[PDB]
Ligand binder design. Sequence first.
Ligand code: 6YI
Ligand code: ZN
Ligand code: ZN
Ligand code: ZN
Length: 441
Amino acid sequence: YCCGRKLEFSPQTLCCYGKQLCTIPRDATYYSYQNRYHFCEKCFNEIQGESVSLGQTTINKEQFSKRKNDTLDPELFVECTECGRKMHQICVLHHEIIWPAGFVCDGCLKKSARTRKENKFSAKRLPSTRLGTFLENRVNDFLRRQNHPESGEVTVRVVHASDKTVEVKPGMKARFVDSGEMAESFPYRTKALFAFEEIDGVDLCFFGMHVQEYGSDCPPPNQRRVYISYLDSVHFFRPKCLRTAVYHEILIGYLEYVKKLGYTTGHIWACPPSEGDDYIFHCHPPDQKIPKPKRLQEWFKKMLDKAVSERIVHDYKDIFKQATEDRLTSAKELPYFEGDFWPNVLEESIKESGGSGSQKLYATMEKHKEVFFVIRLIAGPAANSLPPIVDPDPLIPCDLMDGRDAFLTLARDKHLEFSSLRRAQWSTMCMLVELHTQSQD
Ligand SMILES: COc1ccc(C2(C(=O)N3CS(=O)(=O)C[C@@H]3C(=O)Nc3cccc4[nH]ncc34)CCCC2)cc1
Ligand SMILES: [Zn+2]
Ligand SMILES: [Zn+2]
Ligand SMILES: [Zn+2]
């Protein structure tokens, strides 16, 4: 073995198909059918009756297998076509698409005064966008101002852009849409972008983001607004003392960019993911922790405070303070975003109140105010006569990056973990190959 190390992949986590938001971690005992339908021990024995409705097909309980989530797949080896040396594929970062001729180890290459032919599936060679260019220029300019000897070049790429609509859910639809008081759906553009850092001639994907952008063609209350769907990171940015600043630089640059195009407001739901290691990146490092709510909120406040002092953000408020200043009276006046908290809670509010869309609206907003940031980018009379929003970047069809589920599934299916620096670099290389090959079609 190249290193002296016996290496295997970790058991990926599963789901109690009974209770939503239940998960089955490493070493837990569970019940599975056809390697598809998984139940944890508690959620399985808590089923009354040996009939288990699947799909919908009813399936007997003895047709399930009792097992524990402790399977460890060994890492794969590659063989040098010249010496026969066996090395972990991840250790030497050999990808058969990038180097189809075969794996030649570094030792045989140095003996023959040879080097690997260029990796043309790099982050740098992903197609550029005006947004990506703006973001990476900001980050790299910040990084060279810091003069830290360890920092590498950062490239930012938009890897998906497509048109979508968010549909008002049945409760709010019956209250406000069927009476003609509110649009049935809101058109928006979703964008997925990632940041990579060159670490010793090797790309590392360390940051990912998906956003929802509602243009000047959107009906109120959503028009000229951007909303962050989700954020994620792999904490191996070099150097560590600049990691937080770089995240902040990307986010501030994004607000600066959409402000320039004419978007008036930004929206952030400070919402930690559920415990586990899969959000956008599969299998986070074991010592990278999900922040607790208060610390995440302070993190966003720090970022926005820097944006205010840079004269990019005019000001920001919690949703409760914001609605008070806007003199809001009805739930139909709240921006309605895909997958956001407020569409969900408004469904429950209308149900519990027997059909009201304003009853406890202010109480619910105050109860949760610290979690919802409303960021004003264009204020005062400047926001009044704005020209239409024209995005200079084209659409980018890429099914793998339409939402976060597809890339997570591809990572799970192909053992692309981001749990260590070496595995994250390998997963980055594979992810780039996928993005380069799906595009050339
Ligand atoms: C104050 O400490 C922090 C630490 C990290 C962040 C950022 C971030 O990556 N955050 C906070 S998030 O927005 O709730 C989602 C994401 C996050 O927690 N990922 C994960 C880390 C570890 C295991 C995980 N499993 N699954 C997801 C996941 C870094 C850049 C974006 C914010 C912010 C504040
Ligand atoms: Zn090795
Ligand atoms: Zn369960
Ligand atoms: Zn060799």
